[PDB]
Design a binder for this molecule. Structure first.
Ligand SMILES: NC(=O)C1=CN([C@@H]2O[C@H](COP(=O)(O)OP(=O)(O)OC[C@H]3O[C@@H](n4cnc5c(N)ncnc54)[C@H](OP(=O)(O)O)[C@@H]3O)[C@@H](O)[C@H]2O)C=CC1
Ligand SMILES: NC(=O)C1=CN([C@@H]2O[C@H](COP(=O)(O)OP(=O)(O)OC[C@H]3O[C@@H](n4cnc5c(N)ncnc54)[C@H](OP(=O)(O)O)[C@@H]3O)[C@@H](O)[C@H]2O)C=CC1
Ligand SMILES: NC(=O)C1=CN([C@@H]2O[C@H](COP(=O)(O)OP(=O)(O)OC[C@H]3O[C@@H](n4cnc5c(N)ncnc54)[C@H](OP(=O)(O)O)[C@@H]3O)[C@@H](O)[C@H]2O)C=CC1
Ligand SMILES: NC(=O)C1=CN([C@@H]2O[C@H](COP(=O)(O)OP(=O)(O)OC[C@H]3O[C@@H](n4cnc5c(N)ncnc54)[C@H](OP(=O)(O)O)[C@@H]3O)[C@@H](O)[C@H]2O)C=CC1
Lengths: 265, 265, 265, 265
């Protein structure tokens, strides 16, 4: 006759303690914040990116605070580099339990002025690289046989188009569907949950042209933000850790709204 | 030069300890589970519903496990009863910090056989009651001046129609938009976040004609569940507590996917 | 070996000639335009609304141009008035083949200042009335046994919330799901297609405060209009007639985007 | 005081007579049907594809029925071939007014068994080729200065994931967002409307293992089809011609539902 919920489950459901979290784009604005948040929450953090100097600086900062972390240099669009990077993570920590995909690139340009090569450059850096990293990490999680969590950072641009964004919106719109299809491929058979988060823009990225009366960018975002402010990377730490823990075990194939209401107004 | 995320924030972001959580439909399958989960997580729980016998049984069960809880009897569609119930919660705990709306009703019937009165009965019990409870609790949160969290349980039926569901789908589809509009009304000015969760069906609700070969209900849901199983109410505890804590402070006006991939396949 | 498409089908697929089109809210900005467009396209037009003076003026204008039309006075939220109005249409024209639902009401107000009675007033006028008219017309189409077309005018607000719109967004968000559920109830068994159109605002409705520098309404819509201008009612004539003809025979349960890109940017 | 709609507009709004319609994937199941429908509706049809034998057979069939048509051989992923093909269309007809993109490719495979090269093959043939054709045709429409219409055939898979579809769903999900972004780039400044149609599957594509009791494909689609049947290519002729005519002048950046209710149930 007792309610079907366990105190031990509730007390520990948000935990990532002792889990190995592999973070791509770890040197980025969101990547460095998520990497340190996983570390602060007790995960072993394996950071990856192309920028070795920035990875080394993060590793030193984190180790000084007792975070168990390491890094591997790799271009996420290059499958041989990604494969070798996962091998190094596995040699260091024995397994991969959580993957957070945060790397990305954009170069807005109207379709008329944007060459096919320039559109492809965005697709390779932002979309192909998501397939590469997810395929190779999912294979590693399958090989382990313990399930796993994959969190892909897309954008609110995955669901709304924008002038100059034929490259970025195709990549992000595609990645949200890639995520839903990966959940169809992996969740039931292997216990690997695959979800995306769709953020709005960060405040720091709009600071340069913020004081220009000729620019409406900063204003356009605020009229469209029911939350009442632009985001900071720390605003998505809760959602990412939620999607990386037992608390979200039933959640898969979702494209989570991190827009502060931009998507629903 | 340090990464912009604080250890104290990460360690405590999912906390609901010491918060007053008011749960409607507390006697229901999800309501009783969410009410006990808030209690296990250290919130003061104020349970509400029309069924006094069931509320008393939950209060006794919870108190035996050291949960600080109370109840108030009210029909959530009755604004005088809802106002008296919130006053009773305030007399007991001094404030309301979290609201979880879980009550509901359905009676599927084809439009041709469903009277206008029967469609209205579903709208009153399932949609009007959401407006009543959210309005009165939001007013109480405004009066306190400390912000708050509102979590409305809608359904994956808020985004997908179904035969016999002209009542329920209108109510749920409407409640998702009511939530997005409430965030536009309250989040920026008052710090009240308003979100919904959109669950798929519970396993226990399909168990009776599960052994009936003439029924395709049980199988229809499984072909459409990438997660690979039907849900239990405890599968939504993580999402509800996430949306009731500091970890989701930037998240407002969202209609969160709790479908296990039903919405994205 | 011939391509599977018929010239006779292509030549006549957009036709509404000789069909009986029942238009609710016929006295409104969109209603009068749609009613005259059905007439110009050769349909028999039965106009309905509460405003008899305006219905009489439209009937005289249309008859002077050789349009076969008639009217019936009814409050669309009142099932006895709707039932009697359909009987009068059937006595005049023998059947109903197309239904276009265009009536509506809004009174924006923040949830804190909007009474439950005021929210209900919008729900009754804008949502309940859609259920009433669709149920009674669908029953008439079932009784005829020749199928039919139902086009419900909702709003882009059916998918995006807005400050002060807890009444209107609930009603419109609900009506889109009611439409999808009605298609589940009626399309396969009775050949009745049920779709909605989701328009952006009309230019004429924003003309009053257009010259006010303190108002950002007119500007906010234009930043969010990829089409580059606000709409006129005549801009939705094509979509409504398309959804009322053989050209859309496979299309049902859809919530059609008439936003000029507001929904997708 | 007359209603704001013109008889001349209503009578001619669905016309494509005398317009030059360039159809990609013209040899395909939908392409051949759309190409002949444009011809039957009086457009000059320029068919393109890689299969010359099939293009020649369609040209002979169409000319025998008085259709003014021509063809140009090109791989739509090859920008030099696409540029030469558009030049050939211009040499033949002097301009391009309508573009219908219907070519595509799929090879379903689980992410674990699908190489990065195989995923890229689908992206190139199904997504990159859409960018190539739309960019070069949009440039031609800009050069003419008379506006234009672009209709991209995506899939209901642009909004719903599926097992084995990480290639196809990324491509289609991306193309819907590419369409919305192209409307942001072109519609206001150049009068070029850009929309997609999202079809469900064709009956003929499921006929081979339809008699196989071990297969649930045929039944899975029918439980999810409120329209009550699988589609034929001719079922999308109305929507494509609607989106290619004056009747849809305000419609841009839309991803039109051609799913028969699969998307909304
Ligand atoms: N910031 C914002 O306002 C928003 C961002 N997004 C998206 O969210 C993600 C995180 O954003 P944010 O942290 O600000 O991103 P950043 O601009 O800080 O970039 C993240 C990291 O991506 C890597 N990167 C850059 N270019 C490429 C490339 N050509 N190929 C592969 N990797 C590359 C870099 O790491 P390294 O050089 O070490 O490889 C960089 O540090 C990105 O995908 C971004 O597109 C979504 C919504 C809004
Ligand atoms: N269970 C499922 O499979 C799914 C449920 N949902 C929705 O999620 C919510 C929670 O579901 P679940 O816990 O299973 O629901 P229940 O069937 O257990 O009902 C929840 C509570 O609602 C109250 N209630 C019942 N009828 C009415 C009414 N006429 N007016 C007001 N309150 C009423 C009852 O409490 P009391 O008598 O104490 O007032 C009941 O205990 C509901 O809104 C449901 O519609 C969504 C997706 C799937
Ligand atoms: N105009 C716009 O900018 C937009 C409008 N919409 C919606 O599209 C529809 C058509 O818009 P539009 O033509 O401009 O609307 P109108 O403002 O012109 O109203 C349409 C008709 O609805 C009837 N009506 C008014 N109040 C009520 C009520 N309380 N109960 C029942 N019927 C009522 C009136 O007819 P009578 O008095 O004869 O009964 C009126 O002529 C409406 O539902 C509107 O909400 C959607 C997007 C934007
Ligand atoms: N048929 C269905 O059930 C559904 C189809 N779709 C999509 O709608 C579109 C039309 O469908 P349908 O007519 O049945 O498609 P088809 O299978 O008949 O293919 C369309 C044409 O695409 C061309 N094509 C094939 N492979 C490639 C390739 N590698 N690169 C470039 N072009 C290629 C071929 O023309 P050629 O050899 O002359 O170049 C083919 O005739 C496609 O994009 C399809 O993916 C969407 C929903 C369901």
């Amino acid at each position: 006759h007792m309610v079907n919920v366990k105190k031990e489950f509730v007390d520990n459901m948000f935990s990532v303690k002792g889990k190995v979290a592999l973070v791509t784009g770890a040197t980025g604005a969101l990547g460095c914040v998520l990497s340190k948040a996983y570390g602060y929450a007790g995960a072993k953090v394996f950071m990856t990116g192309r920028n070795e100097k920035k990875l080394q600086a993060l590793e030193a900062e984190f180790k000084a605070e007792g975070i168990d972390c390491a890094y591997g240099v790799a271009d996420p669009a290059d499958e041989a580099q990604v494969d070798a990077m996962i091998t190094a993570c596995v040699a260091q920590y024995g397994e991969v339990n959580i993957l957070a995909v945060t790397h990305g690139f954009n170069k807005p340009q109207n379709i008329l002025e944007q060459s096919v090569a320039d559109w492809q450059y965005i697709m390779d850096a932002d979309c192909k690289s998501v397939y590469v990293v997810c395929k190779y990490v999912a294979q590693q999680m399958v090989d382990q046989g313990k399930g796993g969590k994959i969190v892909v950072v897309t954008s609110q641009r995955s669901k709304r188009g924008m002038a100059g964004y034929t490259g970025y919106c195709t990549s992000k719109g595609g990645a949200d569907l890639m995520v839903s299809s990966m959940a169809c491929d992996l969740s039931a058979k292997y216990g690997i949950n695959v979800n995306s988060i769709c953020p709005t823009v960060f405040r720091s990225d709009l600071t340069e042209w913020m004081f220009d009366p000729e620019s409406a960018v900063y204003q356009n975002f605020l009229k469209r933000e029911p939350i009442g402010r632009l985001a900071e990377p720390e605003d998505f730490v809760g959602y990412a850790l939620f999607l990386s823990s037992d608390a979200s075990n039933y959640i898969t194939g979702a494209n989570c709204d991190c827009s502060g209401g931009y998507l629903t107004c």
